[PDB]
Design a protein around this nucleic acid. Structure first.
Lengths: 83, 93, 198, 95, 107, 97, 84, 104, 93, 177
DNA sequence: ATCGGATGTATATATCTGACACGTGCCTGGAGACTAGGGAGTAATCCCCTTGGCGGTTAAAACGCGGGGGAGAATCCGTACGTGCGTTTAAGCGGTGCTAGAGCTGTCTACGACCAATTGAGCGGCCTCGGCACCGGGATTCTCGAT
DNA sequence: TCGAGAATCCCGGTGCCGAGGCCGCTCAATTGGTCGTAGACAGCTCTAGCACCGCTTAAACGCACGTACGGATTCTCCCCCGCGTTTTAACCGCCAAGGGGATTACTCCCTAGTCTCCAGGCACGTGTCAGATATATACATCCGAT
């Protein structure tokens, strides 16, 4: 029994979202932006991870490897290099 | 020469769903384009699946996983159902 | 079940509102369950079952939450929330939240009830070759009204909801949990039961 | 003390000249595992898998923030608002 | 003996032999299992039936006995999942859905 | 002298051209435009009627979608009038520029 | 000596762009919008027609068929139905 | 004497031929396709590596890290158009701040 | 087992264009992914070209047409040029 | 030329901007120009040069002005794009008329290289005239043979030599409207 | 504007360190030397469909003018967000320890490719009639200025 | 919020051409086998993913203060809409020429296939040098005092 992972979307801290926006060229950030970004990231990871787990299960494996994630990202038109 | 299409099959399915309802040639060609597009999508996804797993054959399992990859929401579910039924009938004969 | 013969002793039945089916097109929500044909044992959403946990060696009670159909590896997946046995709880947490480690173990093992389970927000896929029988879950009042006729293998009671680690107990109506599992989709029910204890 | 905005621009330049990941690794890994828990039980992840997931997510969010900043400036503003993100994701087709 | 088409064994209207041929000679893999054409034809028939049901409803709403492309566009864009599947797809002679923003309305 | 207020006939044209599927650009000017664009790639080309018809279908579809996005961008700036800045923004987010 | 085709981008008249915007749900149209739309349409058609003429040239043909336009559009992620 | 040596290239014509034959692209594969394909791949690798080496020397570094690749690709118009829907890991972004957000 | 890549060839090319320049392992993997991505794009486009014209062979002509479809601008020029040089040498040796 | 055996007598010469070049790597801000040299006598054909071709479709000969030089198309190894001239019988038999109509020329119809001058140079050099080599161009018109607009042909030569083809073509199109 | 203090930064130089470039054994994939069956080059012919023309209609486009209202500028107020500073938290690291499961191997069998005989399913062509386009006439639903 | 005017809508009548059903009639789907190998599968190796412990300290969180930015508000200029009048070229019907798209047939060139042979490239190992890190020192920039 592992400790229940609950509301880990809150782990995407405010300074982290602020850093991401600073990289994107954002000078001033509103308050609702943080929860909006948490939701957006949650949907994104839901789709990508669902596809990656489909690839993992089709290979009759229990471990999600890097190739599954690369294949999912490519399948969603967000091709990723380096892995 | 002969160039085939899905016209008779789409018409059969239409008469099943709507008995006394017709379809124009433009809409018929649209339906044929749709069937061919979905075919290309599912067959390509299954091809890449079998190529990922070092497999040389396209089994109905690859088609099922491709359907679950492409079709969204309930459309997937029902589709898989409609697939499995067909298979379980064909494998029975 | 993984393959078809893994459910050969079972049968899948689907009902929409009340009537049964032997549909194709979508409509403006269908429910699924599985029946053991040797005695007509129906397992649906919200039902409580007992499984042979061959890892602990004893057994473990679960509450069916979702019934995934036609996955890419299993023909039928049985998702269920887990229960907590009386020996899977933390004695220190119960002695500090309600009121030397061996002393609290003694207090708990002597004073607690052998058939008192506790819900968890964690779920585990179940297989039918480990299923025994269907469990009957009581609440706080029905367990005290029914004291004489209590089958030690079929009767259990649940009052609190806590995390799998065995702390931060929160009581809730278990009959209302049975209703809420069948009423709403699992994506929202699991989330609700998860944030009930944080 | 500097005016409100100077430290922000310095942050912009710092985080544009560098390429390190801006999210902590362990909370993100926990998030990935929580999300995957609703798909399959008892899944395992290579380090490289979660790392590729984080790189992809960070790239996605930073590009979305560039488009959101453009959405905010188009309305004669210098502050990003949720309607900016929503409009950017609508134009992109994610909505 | 006597012949029997695989579409009859599967209980489908779409051609199982033609799907099998298109899969084997379509340069998709080295070989094609005998279960892939049945499954694929079934999925194609189901999606065709969905499109045709929604489009026939759209045609009956205009009191027309024949499906035109406009009905197909209405059927696809009014269904959430079908519109999500046919996102990057243009239906010729289909038009757009009757939609006007809130601010553009008269006051 | 009956006279409609500014915006009424605009909304009426919106409703009139949203309930129909006919091509809104003149056919022969479009065909000549396609030929003028193609003459820079290969000299003395011929076109199937279906070719230029499919070109016009796709062109009008793309323009209607871009106009929807551009109107959303104009409304986002608390305006009801589409402007070249809105088209530029729309094509910048789509990745076309 | 075929007929010289010049200034055919002007054939996309102002009322034509107006109708296209009205179908897109546009209430008010600025003056400079029409020229911008002409330019954007020219870019789009240039890309599509260049790819379609590439397909036609590959087939060693002199007549641009509908399948060439369909293939070019589908290559550009603009899948079109109703022509094959 | 390998075919890559006969054609004056560095990429493996034999391996490209193997991948084209067993990649399920067509029934038959001509013996001139792998040569042409490997030559094109060599040109593209050369372009990216030369621009990345330029950007790396401008960063006073003799080893090419992913940041140099991202700079070279995003600064070159046609390369960026080639890798539009492509994400380079560990590459960051180009330094660009809108003119509206500059201090007064 | 052996799992090959494009490392040695990219290293040769790098030493040719920049003799005194190394590359990191992450950038090496990025270059390998880029090579494989461009390869599969060009090969898919050539496959579609052959399939459209009812042909069964991926000749160099299909590769050149796929390059002119996929590579943009001056890249399309030089690449084609390079593709023609190699062939010219290959048919000579 | 279609095949490689269709330009055996010729050769493709590449130049940076004006000096000779013989290389691969796409250099920043350096557009490479191309022309072709016949080795039989070293005759150079590039952008701007006007040539005379055998037009077997009309029975006569036609004069063109080389505008663009496509190398390695997906059907021809070299495509020769050129503006067409209108001869005297399509409106002095050695006065040509420029048009924006383009044409694709094949090298096996080449004859000589036309020497095109304006009106002043035509009056200055009257006693020493060659009928099959020297022509004069004063106007530019439509392919139909009307709407004449006078222009210095030397300046047009320079402008075709300088600016890119896709721009000069549109420029020449709107010169007559 | 111009000048001092304070802050963070660009910059010079030096120091570890672990990641990278090269040496080495080897084995599995590429080359050389034939052969064969079909795909593709190439010429000949049918015929479809693309180009072009002409006349008359008129519906759409172009032009112009009054004017309503929408975009844009300038102003004011409140408050939400930026910036430091101190406190709280857990991310990161640096090891150990284990074992679940990824990965490789060696059969052996069932399933799919391949080819020959047979036919009826799905193709192309041929009418032909009715669903629908076109047009008009009267009713309904707005819109907009005011008793 | 009540009538006059103007768009649209709905229904009746007429005609038309395209959707549908049906007729032969090729050819591809089926049947019926044989044979080859792809993968199902149990087993062994051993890679690395999980779990954990404590320490350090960087990161996150909360809070005080202030300002500058968003949003509402009023005013104004001109620009775009509604509508009338004039001009134009799109459009439809019908006709003719032939260019080039298909189809067919013949030939032969080419690429798959195999068998053998060998070396190119990879897994493994090792030393060592370019970059991440650090401390300190000018230096640009900000910001308020004057």
């Amino acid at each position: 029994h592992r400790k229940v992972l609950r509301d880990n979307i809150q782990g995407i801290t405010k300074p982290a979202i602020r850093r991401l926006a600073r990289r994107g060229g954002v000078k001033r950030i509103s308050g609702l932006i943080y929860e909006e970004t948490r939701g957006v990231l949650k949907v994104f990871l839901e789709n990508v991870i669902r596809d990656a787990v489909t690839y993992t299960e089709h290979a009759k494996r229990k471990t999600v490897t890097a190739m599954d994630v690369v294949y999912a990202l490519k399948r969603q038109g967000r091709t990723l290099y380096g892995f | 020469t002969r160039k085939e299409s899905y016209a008779i099959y789409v018409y059969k399915v239409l008469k099943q769903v709507h008995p006394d309802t017709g379809i124009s040639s433009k809409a018929m060609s649209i339906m044929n384009s749709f069937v061919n597009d979905v075919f290309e999508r599912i067959a390509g996804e299954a091809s890449r699946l079998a190529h990922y797993n070092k497999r040389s054959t396209i089994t109905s399992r690859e088609i099922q996983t491709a359907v679950r990859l492409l079709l969204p929401g309930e459309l997937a579910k029902h589709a898989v159902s409609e697939g499995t039924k067909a298979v379980t009938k064909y494998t029975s004969a | 079940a993984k393959t078809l013969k893994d459910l050969q002793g079972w049968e899948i039945i689907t009902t929409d509102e009340q009537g049964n089916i032997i549909k194709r097109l979508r409509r403006r929500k269908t429910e699924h369950y599985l029946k053991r044909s040797s005695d007509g044992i129906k397992l649906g959403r919200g039902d409580s079952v007992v499984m042979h946990n061959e890892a602990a060696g004893t057994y473990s009670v679960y509450m069916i939450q979702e019934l995934r159909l036609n996955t890419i590896n299993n023909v039928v997946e049985l998702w269920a929330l887990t229960y907590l046995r009386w020996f899977e709880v933390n004695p220190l947490a119960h002695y500090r939240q309600f009121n030397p480690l061996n002393y609290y173990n003694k207090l708990f093992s002597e004073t607690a009830n052998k058939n008192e389970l506790y819900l968890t927000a964690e779920l585990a896929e179940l297989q039918l070759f480990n299923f025994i029988r269907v469990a009957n879950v009581m609440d706080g009042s029905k367990w005290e009204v029914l004291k004489g006729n209590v089958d030690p293998e079929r009767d259990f009671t649940v009052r609190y909801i806590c995390e799998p680690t065995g702390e931060k107990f929160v009581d809730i109506n278990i009959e209302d949990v049975k209703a809420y599992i069948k009423k709403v989709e699992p994506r929202e029910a699991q989330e609700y039961l998860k944030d009930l204890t944080l | 003390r500097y005016r409100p905005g100077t430290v922000a621009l310095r942050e912009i330049r710092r985080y544009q000249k560098s390429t390190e990941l801006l999210i902590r690794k362990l909370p993100f890994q926990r998030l990935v595992r929580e999300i995957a828990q609703d798909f399959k039980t008892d899944l395992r992840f290579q380090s490289s898998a979660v790392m590729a997931l984080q790189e992809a997510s960070e790239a996605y969010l930073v590009a979305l923030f560039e488009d959101t900043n453009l959405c905010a400036i188009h309305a004669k503003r210098v502050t990003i608002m949720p309607k900016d993100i929503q409009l950017a994701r609508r134009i992109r087709g994610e909505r | 003996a006597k012949a029997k088409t695989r579409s009859s064994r599967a209980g489908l209207q779409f051609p199982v032999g033609r799907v099998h041929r298109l899969l084997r000679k379509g340069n998709y893999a080295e070989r094609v299992g005998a279960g892939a054409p049945v499954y694929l034809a079934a999925v194609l028939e189901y999606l065709t039936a969905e499109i045709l049901e929604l489009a026939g409803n759209a045609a009956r709403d205009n009191k027309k006995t024949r499906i035109i492309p406009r009905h197909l566009q209405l059927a696809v864009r009014n269904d959430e999942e079908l519109n999500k599947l046919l996102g990057r797809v243009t239906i010729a002679q289909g038009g757009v859905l009757p939609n006007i923003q809130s601010v553009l309305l008269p006051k």
